[PDB]
Amino acid sequence: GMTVAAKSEIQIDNDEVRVTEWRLPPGSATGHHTHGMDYVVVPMADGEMTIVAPDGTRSLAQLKTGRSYARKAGVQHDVRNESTAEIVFLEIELKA
């Protein structure tokens, strides 16, 4: 298939967190997925993510290196890189 895959590396997966480094080449996509845990995103590169909602509507979100944000369990989205730059962020999922 033509869709380019997002790359992931799990850096930590202990009793507190699962930390995954995500790298999205230009023209890649995570595919739609569902979040089962609250999480923090730490962007490692400046960029522009495309977020596709379950209904197909689309939004762009700016990532700024070192500017973290928090999200709750239940988020459902496809994250795509429609930009010319590799997107890089760490996702820190918050375990119980």
Added chain:
Amino acid sequence: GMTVAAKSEIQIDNDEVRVTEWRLPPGSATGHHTHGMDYVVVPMADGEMTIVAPDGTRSLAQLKTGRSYARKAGVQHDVRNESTAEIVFLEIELKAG
């Protein structure tokens, strides 16, 4: 005093987590503190971070951009910048629970 204060900004703080951005200018220190929460360090820049143990001995943590690591509640240290470059990292502390 001649030591420069470390700078901190709390980016996120909620019932599950606290995320603090630490910026240490050359010649700065956090001051000795203890950690009451397990945490994760995310270095935002390569650096050499001085860690002063309770016994006064020092070591130089080798921080690599984007290479996170985990630490346990109970850590007691002063962290300093004796290098020529600003040190920057996020610290992500987990709440109970």
